Backbone:
């Protein structure tokens, strides 16, 4: 740690404090994150999981019972960008570019059997060139997803897939597609899709929009650990009501990212081939 000079505190992560710092040896500016042998091996494997849409893990430093992760530094997150773009909305070509790039990062990680598990706007970092990158990939498997952060802050449920809420502990890469579909809808509408404040509120918000799932749409759902036959039965809403003014190609893609059955849910690779991306470009964001 003596090789890093702290510049400023940049945030409070799920696992520990995040600082902007300067590497005295290389001169580079980095994001330094303060955080068991199984975790060291898993985190070490992430140093080789390199892609332009994945925030680069520069180093892992384990010293005197503390773990430090050194990441490439990016100047803002999507949560702050969406808040700053609230009055006007993020332009559709930029939403499309961001979704396209995030799907590329997921397709790469998923091809290596690495899941994120906790995607959220605060974990999506942008630069002034038009890129967006996935932060903290693989950290949920190495350290778990807690109910509360190290500062006691509630970990958001808003982007959590229904199979996790229903008690599947052996979930798939589909959980990340669900989270990204929720984020896509939020960029379009400027409001969170499913802002639950408890596990049951999260589930019931999903059910009130997509319909209460049953054996027809999701074979095996009624046998899941936390499924209860007493769940209320709500009808499914049309996506034309849920995400206006998104065009039919965008609504088709979103609906496939939000399928209940993880086996039916579109993969990141198949999503990249969707006609919604026919006219994709890479605009420069207004920052």
Residues:
């Amino acid at each position: 740690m003596e090789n890093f000079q702290k510049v400023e505190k940049i945030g409070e992560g799920t696992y520990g404090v995040v600082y902007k710092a300067r590497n005295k040896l290389t001169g580079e500016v980095v994001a330094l994150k303060k955080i068991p042998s199984t975790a060291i091996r898993e985190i070490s494997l992430l140093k080789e999981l390199n892609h332009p849409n994945i925030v680069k893990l520069l180093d892992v430093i384990h010293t005197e019972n503390k773990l430090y992760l050194v990441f490439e530094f990016l100047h803002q997150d999507l949560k702050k960008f969406m808040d700053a773009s609230a009055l006007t909305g993020i332009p559709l070509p930029l939403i499309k570019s961001y979704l396209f790039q995030l799907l590329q990062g997921l397709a790469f990680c998923h091809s290596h059997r690495v899941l994120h598990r906790d995607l959220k706007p605060q974990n999506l970092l942008i630069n002034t060139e038009g890129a967006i990158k996935l932060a903290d990939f693989g950290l949920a498997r190495a350290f778990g997803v807690p109910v509360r952060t190290y500062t006691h802050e509630v970990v958001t449920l808003w982007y959590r897939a229904p199979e996790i809420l229903l008690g599947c502990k052996y979930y798939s890469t589909a959980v990340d597609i669900w989270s990204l579909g929720c984020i896509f809808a939020e960029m379009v509408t400027r409001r969170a899709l499913f802002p639950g404040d408890s596990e049951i509120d999260q589930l019931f918000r999903i059910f009130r929009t997509l319909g209460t799932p049953d054996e027809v749409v999701w074979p095996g759902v009624t046998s899941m650990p936390d499924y209860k036959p007493s769940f209320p039965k709500w009808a499914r809403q049309d996506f034309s009501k849920v995400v206006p003014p998104l065009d039919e190609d965008g609504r088709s893609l979103l609906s496939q990212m939000l399928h209940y059955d993880p086996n039916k849910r579109i993969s990141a690779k198949a999503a990249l081939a969707h006609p919604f991306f026919q006219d994709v470009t890479k605009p420069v964001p207004h920052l």
About this structure: The domain at 76-287 is CATH 1.10.510.10 (Transferase(Phosphotransferase); domain 1).
